[PDB]
Each structure stands twice: as C-alpha cells, then as structure tokens.
C-alpha cells in the first residue's frame, strides 16, 4: 500500500501561501524512501533517520510556494510576514519541513504573478489557520468603502518571479508534514 506522496511533492501547480493546500493522509503505508535534487530537510521533534519505521494516526501535508529568504520562517517560534500573516507553525510542532528550489517551474521571463502573499493583516495567525478573505485593509480612520485608495489597500501582494533573479528571491516549493498521534487506532504505519 502506497501513501499518495507522489501527488503532494510532484504537483504541477502549487498554491499561494495565503491559501495553502492541505491534504489529509490516512490508511496507507507511509514510506519515505521516495524522498531520495538539492533540497532542505528539517524535522522537528522526530528522528528523520527512522520516519519509515514510525507509526502514527494522520499525516497532514501542507504545500505552499514562498521566496528563498522566507524558508527559515517555516519553523516553530519564528516571526515574520509569512509566519505572522500567511502560515504559522505551533511551538510544539511534531513534524518535518521539506523545501526545494523551483526556479525551473515557477518562474517565467515575463514574471510570475500567480502567487500571492498576505501583506496587511490586523491580528496574528493562530497555528494552521487559513485566511482566504480579500477584504480591503483599513489603515486609517476613513472607510475603504470597497474602494482601494489612500490608507485602504488590497491585503494580497503578488510575488515577482523571474529566472534572472537571485537565489533568495527565487521560488521555493515548501511541503510541511504534520504528524498527529490519536487515541483512536492509528492507520499510517510504515
């Protein structure tokens, strides 16, 4: 039995970090031999050397595209634009983060504007909270009224993805795996 990691990692079109794509995984043998280019593999709270021989209840695969400079923000207790207003890991996070450069796929000479990130947000984000709303932000006492003028801006800012840009600004495909152990009989067993 095979866990559907092939769809998760080798997806053709990923989603923006403000609306990150969550996939639930259960009732399959989870084998991490598949995770065998140049990528970053950081595991928090678990021993990465024996993920294959570790049997828990649910796997949550969350996929999103961010810049190279923002990869370090996908970690427990990190603060930044992505961490605060787009995607936050909890303090006690039992899981792993897998990020790999995707300049070949998510960049074009004209510039890629399909990816967006939330810049303006009043409050912080709770762990694994998804903010999808696109209402105009109020940065002053005057109403935005549904119009985007002075002190009232759209909360979603596009990324500028070009092949000629540096490594820090290049698009990085990030998949974070969250492992949940439940009192109910587990059904993800490598």
């Amino acid at each position, epitope marked *: 039995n095979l866990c559907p990691f092939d769809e998760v990692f080798n997806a053709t079109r990923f989603a923006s970090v403000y609306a990150w794509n969550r996939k639930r995984i259960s009732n399959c043998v989870a084998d991490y031999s598949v995770l065998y280019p140049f990528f970053t593999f950081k595991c928090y709270g678990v021993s990465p050397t024996k993920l294959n021989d570790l049997c828990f209840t649910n796997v949550y695969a969350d996929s999103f595209v961010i810049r190279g*400079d923002e990869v370090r923000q996908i970690a427990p207790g990190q*603060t*930044g*634009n992505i961490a*605060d*207003y787009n995607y936050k890991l909890p303090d006690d996070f039992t899981g792993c983060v897998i990020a790999w450069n995707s300049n070949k796929l998510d960049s074009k000479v004209s510039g890629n504007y399909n990816y967006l990130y939330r*810049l*303006f*947000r*009043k*409050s*912080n984000l709770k762990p694994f909270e998804r903010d999808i709303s696109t209402e105009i*932000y*109020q*940065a*002053g*006492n*005057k109403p935005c009224n549904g119009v985007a003028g*002075f*002190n009232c801006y759209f909360p979603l*800012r596009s990324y*500028s993805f*070009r092949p*000629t*840009y*540096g490594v*820090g*600004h290049q698009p990085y495909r990030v998949v974070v795996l969250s492992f949940e152990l439940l009192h109910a009989p587990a059904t993800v067993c490598g």
Partner: antibody, heavy 116, light 106 residues
Framework: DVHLVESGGGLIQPGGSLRLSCAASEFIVSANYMSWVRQAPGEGLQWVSVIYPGGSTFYAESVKGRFTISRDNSRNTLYLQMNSLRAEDTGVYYC???????????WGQGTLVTVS | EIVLTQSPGTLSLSPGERASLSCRASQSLSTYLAWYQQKPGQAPRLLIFGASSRASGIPDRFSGGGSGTDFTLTISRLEPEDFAVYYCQQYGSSPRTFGQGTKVEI
C-alpha cells in the same frame, strides 16, 4: 491630517535612558507598519526598528537589546524606549509609515537626541 | 547588508534640463529599491518605489528605471526646487540599507 509629530528628544548623559513619542493623525498605528529611522548629523539614513500591525518587532543589529519599540492604541502613539545610550546614537530620529516592510511612504518632522 | 553605492558624490547642473543619479548594489535587488529626496533641514520625502513607480504628489519630472544591480534616477527639467540630497534605499533583504546620498548643486 496625515501629520506625524515627534517629541521626547533632548540631551542625555551616556548610559541614560530616553523615551521618544510619535503622535499620529489619520493613521491607525495599531493597523500600520511603523518604523523608526535615525540620521546622524551630516550622514546617511539608518533604519532603527519596525513594528508590525500584528505586534512583531524587529531592530537593527546595532540597537537590539537596548532599544524597544512599542505602541499605545488608546492615544494612537508610537513609543521608542532607548536604554544604555551610547555616544554613537546621537542624531535626528524620525517615525515613518513603512508600506509593508518595504519603504517609508510618510515621515515625521524629526527630533534631535544628543548623547552628551 | 546589501551595500548601496551612489557613483556621483556631488552633481553640479544649471537649472536647465538634465539629471542622472546612479545607485549600484553589491548583489541583485530585483526592482526592490526606492528613491527619497531630502531637502536641507527637512525630513526625507519618498519619490520612487519599486525602482520605476512614482508615489503620490511627485511631478512627472521625476523618473526612475533599473533592475538587478544598477538603478538610475533621472530628472526631466531640473527646476530649482529639485536641488537637494537624494538617497537610494533597498528592501530586498534585511535590513533596509540606505546609500551615502548624492547632493545636487548649481
């Protein structure tokens, strides 16, 4: 009424503490990215600190652990508490509206802090 | 910290019609640079953001264009009010580093 007004600057013996206030009109400090930027006399600008709308704070490498940025939503003020002031902190400080964490759209009139 | 060097330290033009100020970065910024103008004894005023976009209230005489490491700010007709100091700031990385400043004279 887009004005930003700074106050609290003055002479301070080194190692002393001073608090800067930035009173804002038509800006909601709680809903905006606020920045402190300082200029040494006859020198270039140097960003000091930034506070996010969510509450996250970041500081320049020369001023962390001694400078603290804060906000009060009630009087719509931006505060900067600087402790253990060294002689290289002298200059004119500005409170600025940073559009996101990119650039300062608006600037206050600035106030002068002289360390002895 | 990306170091922003401005090639002319001072630039001395008559109040006619030409100006060019260049900002160079050690590593690429990718149109993440802003231009401010400081009149003497006054707070800096934002002119250009995103290396090619004007802000509110600055006239058509101010223009800017660049990408990668070399960025330029040009003034169409140099009216007497534009004789001040100009700064190039970056936002590509942390922190936001400024240039040394270029001062325009008559």
């Amino acid at each position: 009424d887009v004005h930003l007004v700074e106050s609290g600057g003055g002479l301070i013996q080194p190692g002393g503490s001073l608090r800067l206030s930035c009173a804002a009109s038509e800006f909601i400090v709680s809903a905006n990215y606020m920045s402190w930027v300082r200029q040494a006399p006859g020198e270039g600008l140097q960003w000091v600190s930034v506070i996010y709308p969510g509450g996250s704070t970041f500081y320049a490498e020369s001023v962390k652990g001694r400078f603290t940025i804060s906000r009060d939503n009630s009087r719509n003020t931006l505060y900067l508490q600087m402790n253990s002031l060294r002689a290289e902190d002298t200059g004119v400080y500005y409170c600025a509206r940073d559009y996101g964490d990119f650039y300062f759209d608006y600037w206050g009139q600035g106030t002068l802090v002289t360390v002895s | 910290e990306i170091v922003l060097t401005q090639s002319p330290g001072t630039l001395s033009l008559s109040p006619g019609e030409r100006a060019s100020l260049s900002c160079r970065a050690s590593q690429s910024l990718s149109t993440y640079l802003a231009w401010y103008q400081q009149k003497p004894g006054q707070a800096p005023r934002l002119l250009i953001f995103g290396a090619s976009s004007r802000a509110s209230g600055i006239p058509d005489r101010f223009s800017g264009g660049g990408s990668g490491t070399d960025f330029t700010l040009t003034i169409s007709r140099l009216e007497p009010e534009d004789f001040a100091v100009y700064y190039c700031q970056q936002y590509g990385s942390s922190p936001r580093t400024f240039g040394q400043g270029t001062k325009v004279e008559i």
